Amino acid sequence: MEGVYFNIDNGFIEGVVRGYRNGLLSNNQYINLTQCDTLEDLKLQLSSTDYGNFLSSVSSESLTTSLIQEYASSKLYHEFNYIRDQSSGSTRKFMDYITYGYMIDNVALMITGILQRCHPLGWFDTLPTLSVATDLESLYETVLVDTPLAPYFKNIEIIRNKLYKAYLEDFYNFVTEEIPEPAKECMQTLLGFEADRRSINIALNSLQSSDIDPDLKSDLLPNIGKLYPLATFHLAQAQDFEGVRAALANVYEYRGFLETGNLEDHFYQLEMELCRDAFTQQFAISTVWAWMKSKEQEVRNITWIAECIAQNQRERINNYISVY
Amino acid sequence: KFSFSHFLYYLVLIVVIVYGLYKLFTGHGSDINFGKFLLRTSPYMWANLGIALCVGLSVVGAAWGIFITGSSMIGAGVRAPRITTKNLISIIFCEVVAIYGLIIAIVFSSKLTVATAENMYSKSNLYTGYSLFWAGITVGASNLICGIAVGITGATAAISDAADSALFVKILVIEIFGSILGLLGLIVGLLMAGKASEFQ
Amino acid sequence: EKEEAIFRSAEMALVQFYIPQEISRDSAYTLGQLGLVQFRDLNSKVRAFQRTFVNEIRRLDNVERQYRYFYSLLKKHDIKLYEGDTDKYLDGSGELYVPPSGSVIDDYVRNASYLEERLIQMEDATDQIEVQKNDLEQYRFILQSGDEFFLVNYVTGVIARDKVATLEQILWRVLRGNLFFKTVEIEQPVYDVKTREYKHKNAFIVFSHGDLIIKRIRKIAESLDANLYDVDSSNEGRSQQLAKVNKNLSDLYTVLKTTSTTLESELYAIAKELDSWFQDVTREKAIFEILNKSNYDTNRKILIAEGWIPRDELATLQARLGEMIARLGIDVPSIIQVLDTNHTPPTFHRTNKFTAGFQSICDCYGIAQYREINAGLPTIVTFPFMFAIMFGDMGHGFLMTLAALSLVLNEKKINKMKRGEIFDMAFTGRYIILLMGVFSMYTGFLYNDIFSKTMTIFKSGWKWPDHWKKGESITATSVGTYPIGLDWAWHGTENALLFSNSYKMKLSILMGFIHMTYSYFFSLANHLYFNSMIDIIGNFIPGLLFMQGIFGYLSVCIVYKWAVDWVKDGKPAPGLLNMLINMFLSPGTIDDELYPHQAKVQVFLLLMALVCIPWLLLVKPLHFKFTHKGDIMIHQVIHTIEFCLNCVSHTASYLRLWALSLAHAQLSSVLWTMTIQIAFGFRGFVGVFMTVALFAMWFALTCAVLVLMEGTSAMLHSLRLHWVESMSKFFVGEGLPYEPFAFEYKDMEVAVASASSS
Amino acid sequence: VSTGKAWCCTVLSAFGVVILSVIAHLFNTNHESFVGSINDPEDGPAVAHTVYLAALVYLVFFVFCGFQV
Amino acid sequence: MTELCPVYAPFFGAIGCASAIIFTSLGAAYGTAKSGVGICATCVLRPDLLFKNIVPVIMAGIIAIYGLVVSVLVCYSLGQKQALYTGFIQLGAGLSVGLSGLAAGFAIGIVGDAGVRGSSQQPRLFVGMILILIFAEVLGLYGLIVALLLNSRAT
C-alpha cells in the first residue's frame, strides 16, 4: 500500500513539507498584505505570518522590494535545502532532479555574456565558469560535462529548450521507474503540465522567428503530457498563433485559456490547481513539488504586493495568483 | 525481466513440481504425506511457534504503525508541537496492538505443559498444538494488519490536525475501527484456543 | 490569605483598566513589574500594521536590531558583555515599587542610531584594510616561492582549497593533454568576506603559450574565485616585488593596528553597558506591545485595557496602582473596574519548588480547563510511585535517591547557576527524582530486591524439608506468611518466575484499576463543582457501572481468590483469566465455582455493562434534545465507544507495570551474574583484581544501563499511564495558559532568536 | 588529578567499599543468598576474604582521590 | 537417546539462543545506524543537542541488551540430552524476543531519526520524540517478557 513503506524515510520529510504547506499565505493574509501602506508595514504584517522575523535584520531604510524578494527566496531555498539534506535515496534524487531545472535556467542565463547565477538552487561547482564561456562550442566538453546536465546535452533559447526537453523526458522516466504509484501519477500529471507549458511557450517563441522549422522543434518540444503526441505535433507544424489555437483545441484542459486573458496567469492558476490536488495525496513525494511551486508563487505574489506598495500603482495589487 | 528473489521463487516452484510429478508417476505419490508430517511433528513446535509468532507479529505491526505515525507526527510537529500530545492516541492504539499479542502469549503459555511420551501424539495434544499454532498466527497477523492500519490512519490524523485541529476528531473514529479490528482478532484467537486442553 | 491553587486553578477575575493616556507608560510598567496581569487582546480584529502604538514599537524594534547587531560585532571581535546585576537589583521581580525609565529611552534611540552608523563606518574601514591585508599576504606567499616555475608564459594566484580541484579539471578540459599545473597548500586559513570566516586556500600556477588562451585561463580562474597575481620572470624581479609587498604590509599593519584598537575600544565601551540598554529597551517594547491591547478611546483620552488577575491578588493590584498614582500625584481615577465576563479565564496553578516539576510534567500533555481538578497534585505521588512499581529495586532506588539528594541538598548552589539543558532537566525534576528514588526503595523492599539479591530480615513463611540429598528437587512448606515484602525463600528457586509473575501481574491489574477509579472520581468532582448533574447521570454513573462491573469485578475477584485457601477448602482453584474470558465469550457456564451464585452475579454484571452502553449513548444527548429548547449525538457516541474500548485497552496497558518490573529484575540478575558474581569464583591477588575490575564494570553498567538507561524507561511509561490512563478519565484539558505580563531577565542570547528562528 | 575524575573515582570507590564490604560480610556469615546454592562458592569465608581485600583496594582509591579532592 | 529427548532437540535451543542475540542485534543496529545518521546530520549545526539526540541509539542498545539477556538465559538451559519440549521452549523464547526486538529496533531507528531532526528544528518535540521512542522500545520489551515467560518453563 501507499504508506506502509513510505514513512521509513519520507515520513518526517513529508510531514514537514505539509507543515510548510500549512504555512502558505492564505487569501486573507494576501489581502492583509494588500491593505498595507508601506514596506515597513508589509514587513510587520508578513512577520505576523509564518515567515516570522526574517527581515528582522533589515531596517525600513534598507528595506526594498529587491531585499524582500531575496529574503523570501532565501527562506524558501533554505527550507528546500533542509528537506533535501534530510532526504536520502529516491527522494534525494527526486529533489536533485528538481534542482536540475534551475541549473538549466542558470546555464542559459549565464551564457548570455552582468548575469550572475541568480538562482541558488541551480548552483553547481562550475556554474560561474558559464559567465565566462562565450564560446558555445566549448560549453559541454569544457564546463557542463562535469555537471549533472551531461546526459541532457547532445540563440541560447535553442540550448535551453533542448536541455529542458532532455531533462523533462529523463525526469518523467525517473518518476515512472523509481516513484511509488500515487506520487508517480501526481508527478506524471505535473510533468505533463510543465511540458505543455514549455511546448506552448516555445511555440509562441518560434512564432517570432522565421528559422523555426517544424522538424527543428522536434529537438525542442518534450512530447510529454496530454498534448503529446498529437497536440505536440500540431504545435510543431504550427506556423502562427492560429496554429497554436487549433492545436490546443484538441485537448480538454488548457482549452480556451490562451485565447483570452493573461497566459502566464492561466498557467500559474492551473499550476496552483494541480499543486492543491497533489497535496491531497497523503503518502506521496509529489507533495514536495507542490510545495516548491506553491512557495515560488507565494514569493512572486509577495514581491508583486511589495512593488504595488513601493511604487503605488495599486490597481494591479489584486492580480496575484493564489488558491490558498 | 529478472530479479533474484523471483528467480528463486520460480526455481523452487519448478523443483517442487518436478519432484511431485516424479513421486506421482512412479506410484509413490503417498510419499509426499503432509498429513503424516502433521501427525509425526512435535506438537510443541506448533505451540511455541504460535506463541512466538503471535507476539512477534503483534510487535511487528505495533512497531510498523508506530514509526509510520510517529515519524509523520514528529514531522508535522516541527511547525505545531501541539500535535504530539493530541495525536499520541495513535501511538497508544498501535501499542495496544502489541499488548494484545502479549496477553494472548500469556494465555497460550498457560497451556504449555510437559506431555507424557505415552500420551505425546494423542488427539488432544495434536489438537492443542494446532490450536495454539493457528490461534497465535491469527492474533499475530491480525495485530500486524491492525497496527499498520492504525499507524497509517494516525499519521493521516496527525497531518490533518497540523492542517486544522477540527479534522482530527473524525479520523480518531477510523483509529477506533482499526483498534476494534485487532480486538476482534484477539477474541477470535481466544475462541480458537478456548477449548484446547493443556499438553497432557 | 491568598488561596492555594494546586487542587484547582486560582479564581480569575477580569479587570478593565481605565488608564489616562498621560500615565499609560508608567501604569504599564507598574503592573508589568507587578506581574499578575494577563492582558486580553481587545484589538485582535485590527491589523497589526495599523494598531495604536505600532510606531513606538517599530522604533524600539529598530533599536533592538541595532543592539543585537552590536552583540554580533562583539562576538565577531571576541568581547564579553558585562551582564551586571544592576538590572536585577532595579527590577525587583516580585516588588512592584520601581520607577520606569524616563526620557532616557529617546536617548537610547538617538545613541543607537548614531552608534550603529559609527560602527558601520569603522567596520567598513577595518574590513577593507583587512581585505587588502589578506590579498597582500597571498601575494607574499606567492612571491616567497623560490622556484615553482617550469617551461613561455604563466599566470598564478590563490584559490580556496576545495575549488582548486574543479578549476584544475576545468583547465584540463580547456587544455587537454597540455595543462601544466602545480599547487601549494597554505599553512593556515585566511578570512574571507563572502563567508565572513576563515577558509583554507591554495596557491597555484599554470603555464601557457597563447595570449588568447592565457586570457581564457585568467578569465576562467577569476571565476571560481581565484585571486590572480603578476609575478616577475626572474628571481631578482620577484625579490623586488617581495620587498615592495613587505613595505606595503608594513604600512598596512601600521594603519590596521590603530583602526582595530579604536574599534575594539568602542566595542569594549559597548560591552560594559549594552546589556542594560537591551534590558531597558526590551521592557519598553513589551510595554508598548501591552498597550496595543488597550482600546484607545480618543474622546475620553483613556486606554481601556483588560486583563486576567487572580482575585486574591486583586487587592495587591489595587495597592500597587495606588502606590504608583501617589508617585505620579495625578489624582486620576485609575479605575480598576473588575467586571463579569463569559470569557474562559486562564488556568493558574500556584506551585512551590516541590510541586512545580509534577505540575510541569502533568500540564505538558495539556493545560487544565479553568478551575477543574489539577492532575498534578495526584501526580506528585502517583507518577513517582508507578515509576517505582516498574523500577522496584532498593539498590537502584537508593542510587536514584542519592542522585536526587545531590540536587536537593545543594539546591541553593545549582540554583542561581547556569545548568545547560540535561543538567537543568535533572535539577528541575529533582523532587520528582527524589520521590522516584524513595518509592523505588519501598517497592524494592516489597519486591525484596537490593540489586539482584534478596533481604533476609524476617523469618521466611516457607520452610524447606528436614533433609535432602544434594541435587534433589525439594519443595518448601508454608509454615507461615512473610510479614512485609516478598518472601526471601523465593530467591534462586526455579519456579520463582511463576509466583513473581502471578504477583506482579495481579498487582498491575489491581493498582491500575485503583488508580483509574481514583482519577475517574475526579470526573464526578468536576461535574459536582461545575454543577453538571447531567454529566453525573449520563456519563459518570453508567461509565462507573461499566468500569466496575467488569474490571473492578476482576479486581475484587483477584483479592477474593487470594482470600480463599483453596488447598484447605478442597475446591479447584479457578482459572481467573479463563473465567474473565468466559464472562463475555460464553456467559453462564462458570468453569470452577469461585463463590456461590457466581453465574447469576456474572451474567448480571454482563447485562449491566451492556445496558450502560445505551445509557451512555442516550441519556446525555436526549436531555439536550428535550430540555435545551440531538446535535451532540455524534460526539457522545464516539466518546462512549472510545470510553468502552479504552477501559479494556487501559486495563491491558497497565500490565506494563509487571512488564517493566520483571524486565528490570531479570536484567539486574543477569548483569549481576555476568559481571560481578564471576569474580567470587577466583581467589588470590588475581581474585582481588577480578573483584575490583568486575565491580567497576558492575557498577558502571548498574548506573548506566539499569538506573539511568532503564529508569528513564520507567518514568516515561509512568508518564504514559498518567497522560493516557489516568488523565483521560477526567482531564478535560484545553485550558488557557496563565503566563501573565511580567518583566524578566531577557539575556542577550535571544540574539539567536528572531535571527535564526523562522 | 582533575576534579572530575577525582569526584567520579571517589564516588565509585565509596560505593565499592560499602558494597564489597557488605558482600564480604554476607559471604563471611554464610548467608544463604550468597552461599546456599550448589553453584555458589563452596567456602564462604575464603571468598569473603578476597572481596574484603577488594574493598580495601577501593578504600585506597577512595582515600587517594579524596586527597585529590 | 529417547523419544522425548532426541539428539536433534538441542538444535532448536541453540538456534533460539543464536536467534535472540542475532535478531535483537540487527534491530539494534538498524536503530543505531538510522538514529546516528540523524544525530550526525543534526549536530553539525547544533552539537549542543548531542546528549539529547543520543537517546534513540541508547534505546536501540537496550534492545540488544534484552536479546543478550534472553540468549544467556536460554543458553544455560541447553543440554545434549535435553527434552524436545525445552528445545522448542528455547526456540520460542529466542524467536519471540528476536523478532520483537527486530521490529522495535526498526521503529526506534526511524522514530529516532525523525525525532532528532524535528527536535533540532522544534525543541518542544523532544518530549514527543522520547515518548514515542519509549513506546517503540516497549515492544521489544514485550518480546523479552514473552521470552522470559517461555524460558521459565524450560525444564
PDB file of C-alpha atoms in Angstrom, chain B:
ATOM      1  CA  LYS B   1      12.973  -9.045 -16.784  1.00  0.00           C
ATOM      2  CA  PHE B   2      14.896 -10.618 -13.906  1.00  0.00           C
ATOM      3  CA  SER B   3      15.161 -10.499 -10.129  1.00  0.00           C
ATOM      4  CA  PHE B   4      16.994 -12.904  -7.843  1.00  0.00           C
ATOM      5  CA  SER B   5      14.038 -13.349  -5.477  1.00  0.00           C
ATOM      6  CA  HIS B   6      11.630 -14.154  -8.315  1.00  0.00           C
ATOM      7  CA  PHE B   7      14.281 -16.392  -9.883  1.00  0.00           C
ATOM      8  CA  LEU B   8      14.411 -18.451  -6.684  1.00  0.00           C
ATOM      9  CA  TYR B   9      10.607 -18.445  -6.483  1.00  0.00           C
ATOM     10  CA  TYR B  10      10.316 -19.903  -9.985  1.00  0.00           C
ATOM     11  CA  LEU B  11      13.238 -22.278  -9.369  1.00  0.00           C
ATOM     12  CA  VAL B  12      11.711 -23.752  -6.213  1.00  0.00           C
ATOM     13  CA  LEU B  13       8.307 -23.902  -7.925  1.00  0.00           C
ATOM     14  CA  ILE B  14       9.852 -25.893 -10.783  1.00  0.00           C
ATOM     15  CA  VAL B  15      11.740 -28.159  -8.367  1.00  0.00           C
ATOM     16  CA  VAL B  16       8.605 -28.871  -6.321  1.00  0.00           C
ATOM     17  CA  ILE B  17       6.566 -29.547  -9.473  1.00  0.00           C
ATOM     18  CA  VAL B  18       9.220 -31.903 -10.861  1.00  0.00           C
ATOM     19  CA  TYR B  19       9.543 -33.716  -7.526  1.00  0.00           C
ATOM     20  CA  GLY B  20       5.775 -34.097  -7.227  1.00  0.00           C
ATOM     21  CA  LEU B  21       5.475 -35.442 -10.767  1.00  0.00           C
ATOM     22  CA  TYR B  22       8.381 -37.832 -10.152  1.00  0.00           C
ATOM     23  CA  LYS B  23       6.770 -39.178  -6.980  1.00  0.00           C
ATOM     24  CA  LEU B  24       3.297 -39.391  -8.539  1.00  0.00           C
ATOM     25  CA  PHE B  25       4.331 -41.076 -11.797  1.00  0.00           C
ATOM     26  CA  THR B  26       6.443 -43.718 -10.041  1.00  0.00           C
ATOM     27  CA  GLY B  27       3.414 -44.611  -7.901  1.00  0.00           C
ATOM     28  CA  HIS B  28       4.982 -43.053  -4.784  1.00  0.00           C
ATOM     29  CA  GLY B  29       2.656 -40.050  -4.575  1.00  0.00           C
ATOM     30  CA  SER B  30       1.776 -41.000  -0.994  1.00  0.00           C
ATOM     31  CA  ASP B  31       5.419 -40.406  -0.026  1.00  0.00           C
ATOM     32  CA  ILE B  32       4.597 -36.680  -0.065  1.00  0.00           C
ATOM     33  CA  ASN B  33       2.426 -37.146   3.016  1.00  0.00           C
ATOM     34  CA  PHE B  34       1.786 -33.715   4.576  1.00  0.00           C
ATOM     35  CA  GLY B  35      -0.831 -35.347   6.805  1.00  0.00           C
ATOM     36  CA  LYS B  36       1.744 -37.722   8.262  1.00  0.00           C
ATOM     37  CA  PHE B  37       4.030 -34.700   8.594  1.00  0.00           C
ATOM     38  CA  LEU B  38       1.369 -33.053  10.760  1.00  0.00           C
ATOM     39  CA  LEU B  39       0.901 -36.260  12.764  1.00  0.00           C
ATOM     40  CA  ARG B  40       4.591 -37.022  13.387  1.00  0.00           C
ATOM     41  CA  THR B  41       5.756 -33.465  14.034  1.00  0.00           C
ATOM     42  CA  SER B  42       6.123 -32.441  17.669  1.00  0.00           C
ATOM     43  CA  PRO B  43       3.088 -30.504  18.965  1.00  0.00           C
ATOM     44  CA  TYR B  44       5.404 -28.155  20.859  1.00  0.00           C
ATOM     45  CA  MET B  45       6.842 -26.776  17.633  1.00  0.00           C
ATOM     46  CA  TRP B  46       3.317 -25.741  16.677  1.00  0.00           C
ATOM     47  CA  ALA B  47       2.517 -24.366  20.138  1.00  0.00           C
ATOM     48  CA  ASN B  48       5.704 -22.350  20.633  1.00  0.00           C
ATOM     49  CA  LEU B  49       5.654 -21.143  17.024  1.00  0.00           C
ATOM     50  CA  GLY B  50       2.099 -19.999  17.681  1.00  0.00           C
ATOM     51  CA  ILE B  51       3.149 -18.054  20.771  1.00  0.00           C
ATOM     52  CA  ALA B  52       6.338 -16.653  19.235  1.00  0.00           C
ATOM     53  CA  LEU B  53       4.628 -15.601  16.004  1.00  0.00           C
ATOM     54  CA  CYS B  54       1.684 -14.168  17.950  1.00  0.00           C
ATOM     55  CA  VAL B  55       3.863 -11.827  19.980  1.00  0.00           C
ATOM     56  CA  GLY B  56       6.357 -11.262  17.161  1.00  0.00           C
ATOM     57  CA  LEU B  57       3.801 -10.266  14.535  1.00  0.00           C
ATOM     58  CA  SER B  58       1.848  -8.228  17.081  1.00  0.00           C
ATOM     59  CA  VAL B  59       5.069  -6.361  17.870  1.00  0.00           C
ATOM     60  CA  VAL B  60       5.930  -6.025  14.168  1.00  0.00           C
ATOM     61  CA  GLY B  61       2.538  -4.476  13.457  1.00  0.00           C
ATOM     62  CA  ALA B  62       2.711  -2.260  16.530  1.00  0.00           C
ATOM     63  CA  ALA B  63       6.213  -1.041  15.645  1.00  0.00           C
ATOM     64  CA  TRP B  64       5.335  -0.575  11.979  1.00  0.00           C
ATOM     65  CA  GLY B  65       2.323   1.569  12.783  1.00  0.00           C
ATOM     66  CA  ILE B  66       4.336   3.317  15.495  1.00  0.00           C
ATOM     67  CA  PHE B  67       7.110   4.515  13.265  1.00  0.00           C
ATOM     68  CA  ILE B  68       4.704   5.420  10.448  1.00  0.00           C
ATOM     69  CA  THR B  69       2.531   7.627  12.645  1.00  0.00           C
ATOM     70  CA  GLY B  70       5.354   8.782  14.934  1.00  0.00           C
ATOM     71  CA  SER B  71       7.544   9.939  12.062  1.00  0.00           C
ATOM     72  CA  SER B  72       4.539  11.657  10.493  1.00  0.00           C
ATOM     73  CA  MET B  73       3.587  13.408  13.747  1.00  0.00           C
ATOM     74  CA  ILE B  74       7.169  14.455  14.522  1.00  0.00           C
ATOM     75  CA  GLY B  75       7.464  15.917  11.029  1.00  0.00           C
ATOM     76  CA  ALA B  76       4.104  17.641  11.388  1.00  0.00           C
ATOM     77  CA  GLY B  77       5.163  18.630  14.902  1.00  0.00           C
ATOM     78  CA  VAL B  78       8.032  20.782  13.627  1.00  0.00           C
ATOM     79  CA  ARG B  79       5.590  23.609  12.910  1.00  0.00           C
ATOM     80  CA  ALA B  80       2.994  22.525  15.501  1.00  0.00           C
ATOM     81  CA  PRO B  81       4.494  20.712  18.507  1.00  0.00           C
ATOM     82  CA  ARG B  82       0.950  20.763  19.924  1.00  0.00           C
ATOM     83  CA  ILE B  83       0.247  17.867  17.531  1.00  0.00           C
ATOM     84  CA  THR B  84       2.284  15.446  19.651  1.00  0.00           C
ATOM     85  CA  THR B  85       0.066  15.094  22.717  1.00  0.00           C
ATOM     86  CA  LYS B  86      -3.138  15.428  20.690  1.00  0.00           C
ATOM     87  CA  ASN B  87      -2.340  12.679  18.169  1.00  0.00           C
ATOM     88  CA  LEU B  88      -0.388  10.445  20.580  1.00  0.00           C
ATOM     89  CA  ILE B  89      -3.573   8.359  20.855  1.00  0.00           C
ATOM     90  CA  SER B  90      -2.405   6.891  17.536  1.00  0.00           C
ATOM     91  CA  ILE B  91       0.840   5.638  19.104  1.00  0.00           C
ATOM     92  CA  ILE B  92      -1.296   4.412  22.004  1.00  0.00           C
ATOM     93  CA  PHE B  93      -3.578   2.307  19.814  1.00  0.00           C
ATOM     94  CA  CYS B  94      -0.555   0.967  17.936  1.00  0.00           C
ATOM     95  CA  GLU B  95       0.981  -0.169  21.241  1.00  0.00           C
ATOM     96  CA  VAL B  96      -2.308  -1.700  22.442  1.00  0.00           C
ATOM     97  CA  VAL B  97      -1.973  -3.964  19.403  1.00  0.00           C
ATOM     98  CA  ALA B  98       1.242  -5.460  20.802  1.00  0.00           C
ATOM     99  CA  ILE B  99      -0.301  -5.651  24.274  1.00  0.00           C
ATOM    100  CA  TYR B 100      -2.987  -7.876  22.740  1.00  0.00           C
ATOM    101  CA  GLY B 101      -0.274 -10.205  21.464  1.00  0.00           C
ATOM    102  CA  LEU B 102       1.377 -10.217  24.885  1.00  0.00           C
ATOM    103  CA  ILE B 103      -1.924 -11.150  26.555  1.00  0.00           C
ATOM    104  CA  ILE B 104      -2.544 -13.963  24.069  1.00  0.00           C
ATOM    105  CA  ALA B 105       1.022 -15.207  24.550  1.00  0.00           C
ATOM    106  CA  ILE B 106       0.426 -15.330  28.317  1.00  0.00           C
ATOM    107  CA  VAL B 107      -2.833 -17.238  27.843  1.00  0.00           C
ATOM    108  CA  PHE B 108      -1.205 -19.726  25.476  1.00  0.00           C
ATOM    109  CA  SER B 109       1.859 -20.153  27.702  1.00  0.00           C
ATOM    110  CA  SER B 110      -0.598 -21.283  30.357  1.00  0.00           C
ATOM    111  CA  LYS B 111      -1.237 -24.267  28.039  1.00  0.00           C
ATOM    112  CA  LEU B 112       2.433 -25.323  27.750  1.00  0.00           C
ATOM    113  CA  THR B 113       2.981 -28.426  29.881  1.00  0.00           C
ATOM    114  CA  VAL B 114       5.226 -31.489  29.640  1.00  0.00           C
ATOM    115  CA  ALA B 115       3.144 -34.193  27.960  1.00  0.00           C
ATOM    116  CA  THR B 116       3.986 -37.822  28.676  1.00  0.00           C
ATOM    117  CA  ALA B 117       5.674 -39.848  25.938  1.00  0.00           C
ATOM    118  CA  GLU B 118       2.900 -42.455  26.135  1.00  0.00           C
ATOM    119  CA  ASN B 119       0.403 -39.628  25.510  1.00  0.00           C
ATOM    120  CA  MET B 120       2.645 -37.423  23.359  1.00  0.00           C
ATOM    121  CA  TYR B 121       0.859 -37.501  19.985  1.00  0.00           C
ATOM    122  CA  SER B 122      -2.718 -38.075  21.157  1.00  0.00           C
ATOM    123  CA  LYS B 123      -5.780 -36.394  19.682  1.00  0.00           C
ATOM    124  CA  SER B 124      -5.833 -33.781  22.448  1.00  0.00           C
ATOM    125  CA  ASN B 125      -2.135 -32.898  22.196  1.00  0.00           C
ATOM    126  CA  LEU B 126      -2.241 -32.595  18.405  1.00  0.00           C
ATOM    127  CA  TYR B 127      -5.436 -30.547  18.652  1.00  0.00           C
ATOM    128  CA  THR B 128      -3.931 -28.131  21.162  1.00  0.00           C
ATOM    129  CA  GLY B 129      -0.697 -27.861  19.175  1.00  0.00           C
ATOM    130  CA  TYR B 130      -2.574 -26.916  16.012  1.00  0.00           C
ATOM    131  CA  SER B 131      -4.905 -24.679  18.024  1.00  0.00           C
ATOM    132  CA  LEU B 132      -2.100 -22.680  19.620  1.00  0.00           C
ATOM    133  CA  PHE B 133      -0.183 -22.512  16.327  1.00  0.00           C
ATOM    134  CA  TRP B 134      -3.067 -21.151  14.269  1.00  0.00           C
ATOM    135  CA  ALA B 135      -4.523 -19.005  17.063  1.00  0.00           C
ATOM    136  CA  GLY B 136      -1.136 -17.388  17.596  1.00  0.00           C
ATOM    137  CA  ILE B 137      -0.838 -16.825  13.856  1.00  0.00           C
ATOM    138  CA  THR B 138      -4.368 -15.393  13.734  1.00  0.00           C
ATOM    139  CA  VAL B 139      -3.779 -12.978  16.613  1.00  0.00           C
ATOM    140  CA  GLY B 140      -0.290 -12.024  15.449  1.00  0.00           C
ATOM    141  CA  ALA B 141      -1.214 -11.444  11.810  1.00  0.00           C
ATOM    142  CA  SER B 142      -4.430  -9.600  12.674  1.00  0.00           C
ATOM    143  CA  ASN B 143      -2.400  -7.466  15.081  1.00  0.00           C
ATOM    144  CA  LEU B 144       0.226  -6.800  12.402  1.00  0.00           C
ATOM    145  CA  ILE B 145      -2.504  -5.740   9.973  1.00  0.00           C
ATOM    146  CA  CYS B 146      -4.270  -3.590  12.568  1.00  0.00           C
ATOM    147  CA  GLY B 147      -1.065  -1.959  13.776  1.00  0.00           C
ATOM    148  CA  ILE B 148      -0.087  -0.975  10.244  1.00  0.00           C
ATOM    149  CA  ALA B 149      -3.613   0.312   9.578  1.00  0.00           C
ATOM    150  CA  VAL B 150      -3.781   2.296  12.830  1.00  0.00           C
ATOM    151  CA  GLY B 151      -0.340   3.752  12.160  1.00  0.00           C
ATOM    152  CA  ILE B 152      -1.338   4.884   8.670  1.00  0.00           C
ATOM    153  CA  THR B 153      -4.584   6.363   9.986  1.00  0.00           C
ATOM    154  CA  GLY B 154      -2.853   8.102  12.893  1.00  0.00           C
ATOM    155  CA  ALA B 155      -0.221   9.546  10.577  1.00  0.00           C
ATOM    156  CA  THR B 156      -3.013  10.962   8.435  1.00  0.00           C
ATOM    157  CA  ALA B 157      -4.721  12.227  11.607  1.00  0.00           C
ATOM    158  CA  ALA B 158      -1.560  13.963  12.834  1.00  0.00           C
ATOM    159  CA  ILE B 159      -1.032  15.649   9.476  1.00  0.00           C
ATOM    160  CA  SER B 160      -4.689  16.722   9.249  1.00  0.00           C
ATOM    161  CA  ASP B 161      -4.564  18.054  12.823  1.00  0.00           C
ATOM    162  CA  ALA B 162      -1.493  20.036  11.786  1.00  0.00           C
ATOM    163  CA  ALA B 163      -3.589  21.401   8.921  1.00  0.00           C
ATOM    164  CA  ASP B 164      -6.540  22.036  11.257  1.00  0.00           C
ATOM    165  CA  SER B 165      -7.481  20.746  14.708  1.00  0.00           C
ATOM    166  CA  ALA B 166     -11.101  20.227  13.611  1.00  0.00           C
ATOM    167  CA  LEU B 167     -10.137  17.486  11.130  1.00  0.00           C
ATOM    168  CA  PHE B 168      -8.577  15.336  13.874  1.00  0.00           C
ATOM    169  CA  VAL B 169     -11.792  14.193  15.545  1.00  0.00           C
ATOM    170  CA  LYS B 170     -13.344  12.119  12.758  1.00  0.00           C
ATOM    171  CA  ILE B 171     -10.062  10.353  11.938  1.00  0.00           C
ATOM    172  CA  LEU B 172      -9.912   9.149  15.540  1.00  0.00           C
ATOM    173  CA  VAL B 173     -13.083   7.193  14.708  1.00  0.00           C
ATOM    174  CA  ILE B 174     -11.117   5.459  11.945  1.00  0.00           C
ATOM    175  CA  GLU B 175      -8.411   4.678  14.502  1.00  0.00           C
ATOM    176  CA  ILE B 176     -11.130   3.242  16.766  1.00  0.00           C
ATOM    177  CA  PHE B 177     -12.271   0.971  13.932  1.00  0.00           C
ATOM    178  CA  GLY B 178      -8.670  -0.127  13.419  1.00  0.00           C
ATOM    179  CA  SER B 179      -8.392  -0.977  17.114  1.00  0.00           C
ATOM    180  CA  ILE B 180     -11.699  -2.876  17.048  1.00  0.00           C
ATOM    181  CA  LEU B 181     -10.243  -4.980  14.238  1.00  0.00           C
ATOM    182  CA  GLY B 182      -7.373  -6.079  16.482  1.00  0.00           C
ATOM    183  CA  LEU B 183      -9.724  -6.660  19.404  1.00  0.00           C
ATOM    184  CA  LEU B 184     -11.828  -8.953  17.209  1.00  0.00           C
ATOM    185  CA  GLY B 185      -8.667 -10.781  16.174  1.00  0.00           C
ATOM    186  CA  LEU B 186      -7.766 -11.288  19.835  1.00  0.00           C
ATOM    187  CA  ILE B 187     -11.204 -12.602  20.784  1.00  0.00           C
ATOM    188  CA  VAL B 188     -11.225 -14.977  17.801  1.00  0.00           C
ATOM    189  CA  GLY B 189      -7.802 -16.272  18.828  1.00  0.00           C
ATOM    190  CA  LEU B 190      -9.192 -16.822  22.326  1.00  0.00           C
ATOM    191  CA  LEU B 191     -12.166 -18.708  20.881  1.00  0.00           C
ATOM    192  CA  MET B 192      -9.890 -20.865  18.717  1.00  0.00           C
ATOM    193  CA  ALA B 193      -7.741 -21.750  21.735  1.00  0.00           C
ATOM    194  CA  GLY B 194     -10.657 -21.691  24.184  1.00  0.00           C
ATOM    195  CA  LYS B 195     -11.367 -25.427  24.051  1.00  0.00           C
ATOM    196  CA  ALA B 196      -7.738 -26.510  23.552  1.00  0.00           C
ATOM    197  CA  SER B 197      -6.589 -28.509  26.568  1.00  0.00           C
ATOM    198  CA  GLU B 198      -3.138 -28.377  28.110  1.00  0.00           C
ATOM    199  CA  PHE B 199      -0.450 -30.737  26.889  1.00  0.00           C
ATOM    200  CA  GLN B 200      -1.015 -33.988  28.770  1.00  0.00           C
TER     201      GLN B 200
END
